[PDB]
mmCIF file of C-alpha atoms in Angstrom:
data_model
loop_
_atom_site.group_PDB
_atom_site.id
_atom_site.type_symbol
_atom_site.label_atom_id
_atom_site.label_comp_id
_atom_site.label_asym_id
_atom_site.label_seq_id
_atom_site.Cartn_x
_atom_site.Cartn_y
_atom_site.Cartn_z
ATOM 1 C CA UNK F 15 22.243 41.524 54.629
ATOM 2 C CA UNK F 16 21.809 44.676 52.565
ATOM 3 C CA UNK F 17 20.921 44.883 48.887
ATOM 4 C CA UNK F 18 23.409 46.313 46.423
ATOM 5 C CA UNK F 19 22.985 48.653 43.441
ATOM 6 C CA UNK F 20 25.292 49.490 40.541
ATOM 7 C CA UNK F 21 24.629 52.889 38.920
ATOM 8 C CA UNK F 22 26.533 53.279 35.650
ATOM 9 C CA UNK F 23 27.581 56.895 35.089
ATOM 10 C CA UNK F 24 28.644 58.022 31.585
ATOM 11 C CA UNK F 25 29.487 61.421 30.136
ATOM 12 C CA UNK F 26 26.267 63.211 29.230
ATOM 13 C CA UNK F 27 24.124 61.385 31.764
ATOM 14 C CA UNK F 28 21.141 63.243 33.168
ATOM 15 C CA UNK F 29 22.527 64.258 36.551
ATOM 16 C CA UNK F 30 19.087 64.379 38.230
ATOM 17 C CA UNK F 31 18.511 60.775 37.126
ATOM 18 C CA UNK F 32 21.845 59.797 38.616
ATOM 19 C CA UNK F 33 21.608 61.603 41.936
ATOM 20 C CA UNK F 34 17.930 61.054 42.788
ATOM 21 C CA UNK F 35 18.207 57.238 42.525
ATOM 22 C CA UNK F 36 21.579 57.099 44.278
ATOM 23 C CA UNK F 37 20.388 59.275 47.179
ATOM 24 C CA UNK F 38 16.974 57.595 47.595
ATOM 25 C CA UNK F 39 18.526 54.122 47.415
ATOM 26 C CA UNK F 40 21.093 55.079 50.067
ATOM 27 C CA UNK F 41 18.238 56.389 52.233
ATOM 28 C CA UNK F 42 16.752 52.900 51.891
ATOM 29 C CA UNK F 43 19.979 51.314 53.227
ATOM 30 C CA UNK F 44 20.973 49.916 49.819
ATOM 31 C CA UNK F 45 24.744 49.800 49.262
ATOM 32 C CA UNK F 46 25.120 51.849 46.073
ATOM 33 C CA UNK F 47 28.198 52.003 43.844
ATOM 34 C CA UNK F 48 28.376 54.884 41.376
ATOM 35 C CA UNK F 49 30.598 53.417 38.655
ATOM 36 C CA UNK F 50 32.222 55.489 35.943
ATOM 37 C CA UNK F 51 31.953 54.053 32.500
ATOM 38 C CA UNK F 52 35.136 55.676 31.356
ATOM 39 C CA UNK F 53 37.248 55.159 34.434
ATOM 40 C CA UNK F 54 37.647 56.684 37.961
ATOM 41 C CA UNK F 55 37.668 60.235 36.699
ATOM 42 C CA UNK F 56 34.994 62.876 37.225
ATOM 43 C CA UNK F 57 31.995 62.749 34.884
ATOM 44 C CA UNK F 58 30.547 65.767 33.130
ATOM 45 C CA UNK F 59 26.780 65.316 33.076
ATOM 46 C CA UNK F 60 24.280 66.660 30.565
ATOM 47 C CA UNK F 61 23.725 70.002 32.342
ATOM 48 C CA UNK F 62 27.406 70.289 33.305
ATOM 49 C CA UNK F 63 27.157 69.027 36.895
ATOM 50 C CA UNK F 64 30.403 67.107 37.516
ATOM 51 C CA UNK F 65 30.101 63.970 39.653
ATOM 52 C CA UNK F 66 33.030 61.929 40.975
ATOM 53 C CA UNK F 67 32.258 58.191 40.742
ATOM 54 C CA UNK F 68 32.938 55.810 43.584
ATOM 55 C CA UNK F 69 34.838 53.439 41.336
ATOM 56 C CA UNK F 70 35.529 52.611 37.719
ATOM 57 C CA UNK F 71 33.065 50.237 36.097
ATOM 58 C CA UNK F 72 35.922 47.750 35.659
ATOM 59 C CA UNK F 73 36.550 47.687 39.366
ATOM 60 C CA UNK F 74 32.866 47.745 40.343
ATOM 61 C CA UNK F 75 32.169 44.731 38.233
ATOM 62 C CA UNK F 76 34.732 42.712 40.217
ATOM 63 C CA UNK F 77 32.714 43.484 43.311
ATOM 64 C CA UNK F 78 29.342 42.243 42.002
ATOM 65 C CA UNK F 79 26.899 40.872 41.379
ATOM 66 C CA UNK F 80 24.355 43.498 42.224
ATOM 67 C CA UNK F 81 20.666 43.251 43.078
ATOM 68 C CA UNK F 82 19.966 46.032 40.577
ATOM 69 C CA UNK F 83 21.830 47.658 37.674
ATOM 70 C CA UNK F 84 20.618 51.219 37.094
ATOM 71 C CA UNK F 85 20.948 53.136 33.832
ATOM 72 C CA UNK F 86 20.314 56.899 34.030
ATOM 73 C CA UNK F 87 19.097 58.781 30.963
ATOM 74 C CA UNK F 88 20.285 61.830 29.113
ATOM 75 C CA UNK F 89 20.573 61.113 25.402
ATOM 76 C CA UNK F 90 24.373 61.330 25.208
ATOM 77 C CA UNK F 91 24.835 59.290 28.408
ATOM 78 C CA UNK F 92 22.460 56.643 27.089
ATOM 79 C CA UNK F 93 24.356 56.517 23.786
ATOM 80 C CA UNK F 94 27.646 56.032 25.629
ATOM 81 C CA UNK F 95 26.036 53.176 27.613
ATOM 82 C CA UNK F 96 24.719 51.731 24.360
ATOM 83 C CA UNK F 97 28.135 51.781 22.716
ATOM 84 C CA UNK F 98 29.975 50.104 25.581
ATOM 85 C CA UNK F 99 30.953 46.433 25.362
ATOM 86 C CA UNK F 100 31.476 46.487 29.137
ATOM 87 C CA UNK F 101 27.869 47.583 29.684
ATOM 88 C CA UNK F 102 26.695 44.870 27.278
ATOM 89 C CA UNK F 103 28.463 42.214 29.347
ATOM 90 C CA UNK F 104 27.155 43.549 32.681
ATOM 91 C CA UNK F 105 23.572 43.712 31.434
ATOM 92 C CA UNK F 106 23.728 40.291 29.766
ATOM 93 C CA UNK F 107 25.108 38.768 32.974
ATOM 94 C CA UNK F 108 22.431 40.526 35.084
ATOM 95 C CA UNK F 109 19.692 39.256 32.805
ATOM 96 C CA UNK F 110 21.205 35.770 32.834
ATOM 97 C CA UNK F 111 21.174 35.624 36.665
ATOM 98 C CA UNK F 112 17.603 36.922 36.833
ATOM 99 C CA UNK F 113 18.577 40.206 38.456
ATOM 100 C CA UNK F 114 16.702 43.507 38.229
ATOM 101 C CA UNK F 115 17.644 46.108 35.594
ATOM 102 C CA UNK F 116 16.254 49.638 35.953
ATOM 103 C CA UNK F 117 16.504 52.387 33.322
ATOM 104 C CA UNK F 118 15.039 55.896 33.008
ATOM 105 C CA UNK F 119 14.302 58.466 30.237
ATOM 106 C CA UNK F 120 16.656 57.579 27.312
ATOM 107 C CA UNK F 121 18.361 54.941 29.484
ATOM 108 C CA UNK F 122 16.080 52.123 28.263
ATOM 109 C CA UNK F 123 17.444 52.604 24.734
ATOM 110 C CA UNK F 124 20.664 50.988 25.982
ATOM 111 C CA UNK F 125 18.556 47.874 26.667
ATOM 112 C CA UNK F 126 17.605 47.945 22.973
ATOM 113 C CA UNK F 127 21.212 48.373 21.883
ATOM 114 C CA UNK F 128 22.342 45.411 23.956
ATOM 115 C CA UNK F 129 19.257 43.221 23.122
ATOM 116 C CA UNK F 130 18.155 43.092 26.795
ATOM 117 C CA UNK F 131 14.639 42.306 27.911
ATOM 118 C CA UNK F 132 12.925 41.914 24.568
ATOM 119 C CA UNK F 133 9.273 41.080 24.953
ATOM 120 C CA UNK F 134 8.839 43.336 27.983
ATOM 121 C CA UNK F 135 6.536 46.282 28.495
ATOM 122 C CA UNK F 136 8.635 49.431 28.857
ATOM 123 C CA UNK F 137 8.357 53.159 29.078
ATOM 124 C CA UNK F 138 10.829 55.890 28.155
ATOM 125 C CA UNK F 139 10.864 59.649 27.823
ATOM 126 C CA UNK F 140 8.249 60.519 25.178
ATOM 127 C CA UNK F 141 10.997 61.783 22.899
ATOM 128 C CA UNK F 142 12.864 58.432 23.155
ATOM 129 C CA UNK F 143 9.827 56.283 22.273
ATOM 130 C CA UNK F 144 10.537 55.973 18.540
ATOM 131 C CA UNK F 145 14.157 54.915 19.153
ATOM 132 C CA UNK F 146 13.149 52.368 21.802
ATOM 133 C CA UNK F 147 10.386 50.973 19.586
ATOM 134 C CA UNK F 148 12.542 50.435 16.476
ATOM 135 C CA UNK F 149 11.769 46.874 15.426
ATOM 136 C CA UNK F 150 8.838 46.399 17.825
ATOM 137 C CA UNK F 151 10.874 44.352 20.288
ATOM 138 C CA UNK F 152 9.132 45.848 23.356
ATOM 139 C CA UNK F 153 5.530 46.944 24.083
ATOM 140 C CA UNK F 154 5.249 50.586 24.989
ATOM 141 C CA UNK F 155 3.672 52.049 28.102
ATOM 142 C CA UNK F 156 2.851 55.590 29.172
ATOM 143 C CA UNK F 157 2.955 54.735 32.857
ATOM 144 C CA UNK F 158 5.291 56.954 34.837
ATOM 145 C CA UNK F 159 7.049 53.841 36.093
ATOM 146 C CA UNK F 160 6.669 50.508 34.289
ATOM 147 C CA UNK F 161 7.809 47.226 35.787
ATOM 148 C CA UNK F 162 7.508 44.000 33.801
ATOM 149 C CA UNK F 163 9.182 41.550 36.131
ATOM 150 C CA UNK F 164 12.952 42.219 36.092
ATOM 151 C CA UNK F 165 12.826 45.170 33.643
ATOM 152 C CA UNK F 166 11.890 48.432 35.425
ATOM 153 C CA UNK F 167 11.659 51.619 33.348
ATOM 154 C CA UNK F 168 10.613 55.240 33.794
ATOM 155 C CA UNK F 169 10.183 58.436 31.837
ATOM 156 C CA UNK F 170 12.035 61.583 32.876
ATOM 157 C CA UNK F 171 13.509 63.888 35.510
ATOM 158 C CA UNK F 172 10.055 64.355 37.001
ATOM 159 C CA UNK F 173 9.504 60.592 37.436
ATOM 160 C CA UNK F 174 12.866 59.990 39.106
ATOM 161 C CA UNK F 175 11.550 59.840 42.665
ATOM 162 C CA UNK F 176 8.861 57.349 41.620
ATOM 163 C CA UNK F 177 11.510 55.347 39.724
ATOM 164 C CA UNK F 178 13.866 55.285 42.702
ATOM 165 C CA UNK F 179 11.101 54.317 45.143
ATOM 166 C CA UNK F 180 9.995 51.524 42.782
ATOM 167 C CA UNK F 181 13.558 50.162 42.915
ATOM 168 C CA UNK F 182 13.491 50.431 46.734
ATOM 169 C CA UNK F 183 10.178 48.584 46.835
ATOM 170 C CA UNK F 184 11.486 45.846 44.551
ATOM 171 C CA UNK F 185 14.594 45.261 46.668
ATOM 172 C CA UNK F 186 13.536 46.132 50.249
ATOM 173 C CA UNK F 187 9.722 45.972 50.151
ATOM 174 C CA UNK F 188 6.765 48.342 50.318
ATOM 175 C CA UNK F 189 7.169 49.230 53.994
ATOM 176 C CA UNK F 190 10.737 50.499 53.541
ATOM 177 C CA UNK F 191 9.710 52.392 50.421
ATOM 178 C CA UNK F 192 6.908 54.113 52.378
ATOM 179 C CA UNK F 193 9.239 54.982 55.261
ATOM 180 C CA UNK F 194 11.848 56.471 52.894
ATOM 181 C CA UNK F 195 9.171 58.369 50.980
ATOM 182 C CA UNK F 196 7.627 60.314 53.883
ATOM 183 C CA UNK F 197 10.652 62.511 54.764
ATOM 184 C CA UNK F 198 11.084 63.447 51.099
ATOM 185 C CA UNK F 199 8.010 65.741 51.087
ATOM 186 C CA UNK F 200 6.598 64.310 47.824
ATOM 187 C CA UNK F 201 3.098 65.453 46.925
ATOM 188 C CA UNK E 30 21.150 89.260 28.624
ATOM 189 C CA UNK E 31 20.877 86.101 30.704
ATOM 190 C CA UNK E 32 20.162 85.878 34.419
ATOM 191 C CA UNK E 33 22.790 84.500 36.767
ATOM 192 C CA UNK E 34 22.551 82.154 39.763
ATOM 193 C CA UNK E 35 25.006 81.367 42.555
ATOM 194 C CA UNK E 36 24.488 77.955 44.203
ATOM 195 C CA UNK E 37 26.547 77.607 47.382
ATOM 196 C CA UNK E 38 27.695 74.013 47.893
ATOM 197 C CA UNK E 39 28.940 72.910 51.344
ATOM 198 C CA UNK E 40 29.919 69.530 52.751
ATOM 199 C CA UNK E 41 26.782 67.674 53.803
ATOM 200 C CA UNK E 42 24.488 69.454 51.370
ATOM 201 C CA UNK E 43 21.482 67.534 50.103
ATOM 202 C CA UNK E 44 22.733 66.546 46.660
ATOM 203 C CA UNK E 45 19.224 66.352 45.140
ATOM 204 C CA UNK E 46 18.623 69.944 46.271
ATOM 205 C CA UNK E 47 21.865 70.991 44.630
ATOM 206 C CA UNK E 48 21.514 69.179 41.324
ATOM 207 C CA UNK E 49 17.791 69.651 40.640
ATOM 208 C CA UNK E 50 17.999 73.472 40.892
ATOM 209 C CA UNK E 51 21.284 73.680 38.988
ATOM 210 C CA UNK E 52 20.008 71.478 36.142
ATOM 211 C CA UNK E 53 16.544 73.087 35.884
ATOM 212 C CA UNK E 54 18.030 76.592 35.995
ATOM 213 C CA UNK E 55 20.493 75.687 33.227
ATOM 214 C CA UNK E 56 17.569 74.317 31.193
ATOM 215 C CA UNK E 57 16.029 77.774 31.605
ATOM 216 C CA UNK E 58 19.158 79.426 30.124
ATOM 217 C CA UNK E 59 20.276 80.846 33.484
ATOM 218 C CA UNK E 60 24.066 81.041 33.868
ATOM 219 C CA UNK E 61 24.630 79.002 37.035
ATOM 220 C CA UNK E 62 27.809 78.913 39.121
ATOM 221 C CA UNK E 63 28.160 76.037 41.578
ATOM 222 C CA UNK E 64 30.473 77.552 44.195
ATOM 223 C CA UNK E 65 32.262 75.516 46.829
ATOM 224 C CA UNK E 66 32.121 76.947 50.281
ATOM 225 C CA UNK E 67 35.386 75.391 51.277
ATOM 226 C CA UNK E 68 37.344 75.951 48.107
ATOM 227 C CA UNK E 69 37.612 74.433 44.565
ATOM 228 C CA UNK E 70 37.765 70.883 45.822
ATOM 229 C CA UNK E 71 35.126 68.187 45.417
ATOM 230 C CA UNK E 72 32.234 68.252 47.893
ATOM 231 C CA UNK E 73 30.932 65.206 49.711
ATOM 232 C CA UNK E 74 27.162 65.579 49.936
ATOM 233 C CA UNK E 75 24.808 64.184 52.558
ATOM 234 C CA UNK E 76 24.242 60.830 50.808
ATOM 235 C CA UNK E 77 27.880 60.620 49.677
ATOM 236 C CA UNK E 78 27.441 61.875 46.103
ATOM 237 C CA UNK E 79 30.615 63.861 45.334
ATOM 238 C CA UNK E 80 30.150 66.991 43.215
ATOM 239 C CA UNK E 81 32.972 69.091 41.762
ATOM 240 C CA UNK E 82 32.135 72.812 42.031
ATOM 241 C CA UNK E 83 32.634 75.206 39.163
ATOM 242 C CA UNK E 84 34.585 77.617 41.322
ATOM 243 C CA UNK E 85 35.423 78.460 44.905
ATOM 244 C CA UNK E 86 32.988 80.783 46.639
ATOM 245 C CA UNK E 87 35.809 83.330 46.947
ATOM 246 C CA UNK E 88 36.265 83.404 43.215
ATOM 247 C CA UNK E 89 32.543 83.269 42.407
ATOM 248 C CA UNK E 90 31.881 86.269 44.548
ATOM 249 C CA UNK E 91 34.307 88.339 42.450
ATOM 250 C CA UNK E 92 32.166 87.525 39.451
ATOM 251 C CA UNK E 93 28.833 88.695 40.914
ATOM 252 C CA UNK E 94 26.393 90.015 41.648
ATOM 253 C CA UNK E 95 23.868 87.337 40.919
ATOM 254 C CA UNK E 96 20.139 87.506 40.235
ATOM 255 C CA UNK E 97 19.612 84.713 42.764
ATOM 256 C CA UNK E 98 21.640 83.127 45.577
ATOM 257 C CA UNK E 99 20.531 79.542 46.211
ATOM 258 C CA UNK E 100 21.049 77.634 49.453
ATOM 259 C CA UNK E 101 20.485 73.859 49.283
ATOM 260 C CA UNK E 102 19.449 71.953 52.401
ATOM 261 C CA UNK E 103 20.783 68.931 54.194
ATOM 262 C CA UNK E 104 21.226 69.655 57.889
ATOM 263 C CA UNK E 105 25.035 69.517 57.908
ATOM 264 C CA UNK E 106 25.308 71.565 54.691
ATOM 265 C CA UNK E 107 22.940 74.162 56.119
ATOM 266 C CA UNK E 108 24.982 74.330 59.332
ATOM 267 C CA UNK E 109 28.174 74.882 57.341
ATOM 268 C CA UNK E 110 26.416 77.703 55.434
ATOM 269 C CA UNK E 111 25.219 79.122 58.745
ATOM 270 C CA UNK E 112 28.707 79.144 60.230
ATOM 271 C CA UNK E 113 30.379 80.858 57.285
ATOM 272 C CA UNK E 114 31.289 84.548 57.461
ATOM 273 C CA UNK E 115 31.641 84.503 53.666
ATOM 274 C CA UNK E 116 28.035 83.332 53.284
ATOM 275 C CA UNK E 117 26.916 86.021 55.742
ATOM 276 C CA UNK E 118 28.533 88.713 53.595
ATOM 277 C CA UNK E 119 27.101 87.349 50.325
ATOM 278 C CA UNK E 120 23.583 87.112 51.734
ATOM 279 C CA UNK E 121 23.744 90.536 53.394
ATOM 280 C CA UNK E 122 24.944 92.086 50.128
ATOM 281 C CA UNK E 123 22.211 90.271 48.141
ATOM 282 C CA UNK E 124 19.553 91.485 50.543
ATOM 283 C CA UNK E 125 20.990 95.003 50.448
ATOM 284 C CA UNK E 126 20.781 95.146 46.622
ATOM 285 C CA UNK E 127 17.234 93.773 46.616
ATOM 286 C CA UNK E 128 18.201 90.509 44.948
ATOM 287 C CA UNK E 129 16.407 87.171 45.260
ATOM 288 C CA UNK E 130 17.523 84.591 47.847
ATOM 289 C CA UNK E 131 16.191 81.032 47.551
ATOM 290 C CA UNK E 132 16.618 78.291 50.167
ATOM 291 C CA UNK E 133 15.243 74.752 50.545
ATOM 292 C CA UNK E 134 14.686 72.168 53.346
ATOM 293 C CA UNK E 135 17.153 73.106 56.161
ATOM 294 C CA UNK E 136 18.702 75.778 53.914
ATOM 295 C CA UNK E 137 16.421 78.548 55.239
ATOM 296 C CA UNK E 138 17.954 78.097 58.703
ATOM 297 C CA UNK E 139 21.079 79.779 57.310
ATOM 298 C CA UNK E 140 18.878 82.849 56.723
ATOM 299 C CA UNK E 141 18.098 82.759 60.456
ATOM 300 C CA UNK E 142 21.760 82.407 61.381
ATOM 301 C CA UNK E 143 22.732 85.391 59.260
ATOM 302 C CA UNK E 144 19.643 87.516 60.235
ATOM 303 C CA UNK E 145 18.372 87.621 56.616
ATOM 304 C CA UNK E 146 14.793 88.333 55.662
ATOM 305 C CA UNK E 147 13.226 88.691 59.080
ATOM 306 C CA UNK E 148 9.544 89.448 58.863
ATOM 307 C CA UNK E 149 9.019 87.183 55.854
ATOM 308 C CA UNK E 150 6.756 84.189 55.446
ATOM 309 C CA UNK E 151 8.902 81.084 54.988
ATOM 310 C CA UNK E 152 8.692 77.352 54.777
ATOM 311 C CA UNK E 153 11.259 74.673 55.586
ATOM 312 C CA UNK E 154 11.388 70.915 55.914
ATOM 313 C CA UNK E 155 8.915 69.993 58.676
ATOM 314 C CA UNK E 156 11.790 68.787 60.826
ATOM 315 C CA UNK E 157 13.573 72.175 60.486
ATOM 316 C CA UNK E 158 10.536 74.262 61.507
ATOM 317 C CA UNK E 159 11.409 74.588 65.205
ATOM 318 C CA UNK E 160 14.975 75.721 64.427
ATOM 319 C CA UNK E 161 13.793 78.245 61.828
ATOM 320 C CA UNK E 162 11.106 79.584 64.168
ATOM 321 C CA UNK E 163 13.390 80.168 67.177
ATOM 322 C CA UNK E 164 12.593 83.713 68.264
ATOM 323 C CA UNK E 165 9.545 84.125 66.000
ATOM 324 C CA UNK E 166 11.424 86.213 63.448
ATOM 325 C CA UNK E 167 9.575 84.680 60.462
ATOM 326 C CA UNK E 168 5.967 83.509 59.900
ATOM 327 C CA UNK E 169 5.720 79.861 59.006
ATOM 328 C CA UNK E 170 4.033 78.364 55.967
ATOM 329 C CA UNK E 171 3.239 74.806 54.934
ATOM 330 C CA UNK E 172 3.156 75.661 51.249
ATOM 331 C CA UNK E 173 5.445 73.490 49.164
ATOM 332 C CA UNK E 174 7.079 76.639 47.829
ATOM 333 C CA UNK E 175 6.712 79.964 49.651
ATOM 334 C CA UNK E 176 7.714 83.268 48.103
ATOM 335 C CA UNK E 177 7.437 86.488 50.103
ATOM 336 C CA UNK E 178 8.951 88.972 47.700
ATOM 337 C CA UNK E 179 12.733 88.381 47.566
ATOM 338 C CA UNK E 180 12.780 85.429 50.017
ATOM 339 C CA UNK E 181 11.832 82.148 48.278
ATOM 340 C CA UNK E 182 11.762 78.958 50.362
ATOM 341 C CA UNK E 183 10.772 75.315 49.963
ATOM 342 C CA UNK E 184 10.499 72.112 51.936
ATOM 343 C CA UNK E 185 12.367 69.003 50.812
ATOM 344 C CA UNK E 186 13.767 66.729 48.112
ATOM 345 C CA UNK E 187 10.259 66.189 46.780
ATOM 346 C CA UNK E 188 9.610 69.940 46.373
ATOM 347 C CA UNK E 189 12.879 70.611 44.551
ATOM 348 C CA UNK E 190 11.399 70.731 41.056
ATOM 349 C CA UNK E 191 8.709 73.167 42.224
ATOM 350 C CA UNK E 192 11.399 75.224 43.998
ATOM 351 C CA UNK E 193 13.615 75.334 40.915
ATOM 352 C CA UNK E 194 10.722 76.243 38.604
ATOM 353 C CA UNK E 195 9.667 79.014 41.013
ATOM 354 C CA UNK E 196 13.192 80.449 40.718
ATOM 355 C CA UNK E 197 12.955 80.177 36.906
ATOM 356 C CA UNK E 198 9.604 81.955 36.958
ATOM 357 C CA UNK E 199 10.958 84.720 39.182
ATOM 358 C CA UNK E 200 13.952 85.369 36.925
ATOM 359 C CA UNK E 201 12.751 84.475 33.396
ATOM 360 C CA UNK E 202 8.942 84.555 33.667
ATOM 361 C CA UNK E 203 6.031 82.124 33.634
ATOM 362 C CA UNK E 204 6.284 81.243 29.944
ATOM 363 C CA UNK E 205 9.895 80.048 30.233
ATOM 364 C CA UNK E 206 9.051 78.136 33.396
ATOM 365 C CA UNK E 207 6.200 76.356 31.567
ATOM 366 C CA UNK E 208 8.414 75.534 28.581
ATOM 367 C CA UNK E 209 11.159 74.101 30.825
ATOM 368 C CA UNK E 210 8.613 72.149 32.859
ATOM 369 C CA UNK E 211 6.978 70.171 30.028
ATOM 370 C CA UNK E 212 10.005 68.037 29.008
ATOM 371 C CA UNK E 213 10.623 67.112 32.650
ATOM 372 C CA UNK E 214 7.601 64.754 32.801
ATOM 373 C CA UNK E 215 6.310 66.157 36.127
ATOM 374 C CA UNK E 216 2.880 64.941 37.183
#
């Protein structure tokens, strides 16, 4: 049995924070679905890379549940995630079933918007801290990857490999994470 | 005047090595064209991320020359680059005009195939060393990024940020590279 990941891809997502986790998770033998928030259509990311999702979010949800739901960053992508009732329902359901949620950079601010994981330690991009911390519902961390049980967060493009490998470790264990890491040529 | 980059995107390319350089170069204010080897159509990368190119290679070439030509890795992507007469012509012309060529992971093996940059120090992914070194036409390096004048090479997914920032430094200078680097949250 392989583990399954849902990566929710919205217009304005940080493309590095979409592709690095998708690719590293696939290297780990996780079955990853790249789901488009807005539909099946191609998604224009924050730096204009255009990615074709595997499925619409509507369709991907019918094929769940997933062992992890992953929220990339990029401020505009994160805002689109935050404004989506469909994302609210997916995240609520994932929390309710005690499944992992992982978010990077501005992505964790969608957790705030949807009232997910309050009382957790979290990190974000430094520039997203004040937004995430509005109301004091989370405790902030400067660790490059933070994991407080089922809420896994990270900071930026440059922490994306660490973020992805932390997801791999959570789902498939330390040994698999180490095996996937070596061929990447990380320092 | 802004600097211009051509990123040549073939089926089986390493998607992290496509997106990280495109995104970081765009952050640096470089005008980047993602050109599809095979045409305008979407490209299925090595770990099944599907990227829509900006233009066909045929069309992108008419809009050159470029300050850098970038070759992502992924073994199958690199082989498709290596087998393309169009890539041969672009790389020959770039070399002839004394323009920068940058290649990562298995990407430098396309330089071998097209007889580009012989006599240079180069690096590759460790697993691509023997292929690159067939005939002893280059001198090998284990540096994470190697730059021998106009031939800039790098090793793997985990060296892609360093690779991209080395391209930025070469085109736009150290100050711009440092400014682009800080918001990435690199260690």
